[PDB]
Amino acid sequence: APKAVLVGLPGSGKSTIGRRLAKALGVGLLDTDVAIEQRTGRSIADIFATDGEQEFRRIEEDVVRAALADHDGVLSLGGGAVTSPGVRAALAGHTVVYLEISAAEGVRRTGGNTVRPLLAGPDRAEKYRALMAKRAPLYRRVATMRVDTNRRNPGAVVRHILSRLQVPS
Numbered sequence: 001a002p003k004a005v006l007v008g009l010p011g012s013g014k015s016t017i018g019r020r021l022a023k024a025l026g027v028g029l030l031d032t033d034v035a036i037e038q039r040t041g042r043s044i045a046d047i048f049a050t051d052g053e054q055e056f057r058r059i060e061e062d063v064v065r066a067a068l069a070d071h072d073g074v075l076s077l078g079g080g081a082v083t084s085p086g087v088r089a090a091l092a093g094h095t096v097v098y099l100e101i102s103a104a105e106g107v108r109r110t111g112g113n114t115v116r117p118l119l120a121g122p123d124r125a126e127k128y129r130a131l132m133a134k135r136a137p138l139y140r141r142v143a144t145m146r147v148d149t150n151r152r153n154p155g156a157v158v159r160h161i162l163s164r165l166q167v168p169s
């Protein structure tokens with residue numbers, strides 16, 4: 001089972017923190033989005049476009065539950081995985097790190113040409129605030145440690161992480 005599970009919105013640092021936290025703890029990183037593409041042979045975008053979000057969430061839930069059982073390092077969950085009650089259920093008892101980010105920073109950090117079915121222009125900032133508003137309680141419900149990525153250098157938020165895992169609370 002994973003040493004840590006990372007949850008948060010797109011732009012919250014899951015891939016980069018994942019990377020730094022993993023190096024720090026000395027294990028591998030798995031991203032569930034990558035795992036979905038591997039198992040299905042399909043792009044995330046294609047699944048949403050052709051089969052739709054609900055089918056994506058079912059696939060995602062199965063991949064996440066498997067990953068929680070089978071992987072021993074750091075696991076990063078796609079930003080919408082916590083909307084699935086079965087995912088929240090499976091997270092019970094794990095160490096779960098919520099990477100908190102404000103809308104402005106999150107919006108800035110997601111503004112490239114990455115394909116994002118749920119965060120595509122125009123009015124991306126409105127869409128991001130909507131996701132935040134809906135998902136905030138769900139991240140909070142599952143998380144065992146929260147870290148602020150808004151201002152801190154990454155390598156730092158991670159110190160908060162490696163240090164935190166280690167001592168009581």
Ligand SMILES: O=C(O)C1=C[C@@H](OP(=O)(O)O)[C@@H](O)[C@H](O)C1
Pocket residue numbers: 008009010011014033044077078079080081115116117118
């Ligand atoms: O907000 C979402 O529902 C999604 C976030 C993405 O994960 P990241 O947060 O890893 O980009 C990816 O799973 C997909 O585009 C759906």
Ligand SMILES: [Cl-]
Pocket residue numbers: 018019020022023029
């Ligand atoms: Cl790494």
Ligand SMILES: [Cl-]
Pocket residue numbers: 056057058059060061080081082083084087
């Ligand atoms: Cl899901």
Ligand SMILES: [Mg+2]
Pocket residue numbers: 016019
């Ligand atoms: Mg980096």
Ligand SMILES: [Mg+2]
Pocket residue numbers: 037042043044045
């Ligand atoms: Mg893809």
Ligand SMILES: [Mg+2]
Pocket residue numbers: 055058059
């Ligand atoms: Mg299916």
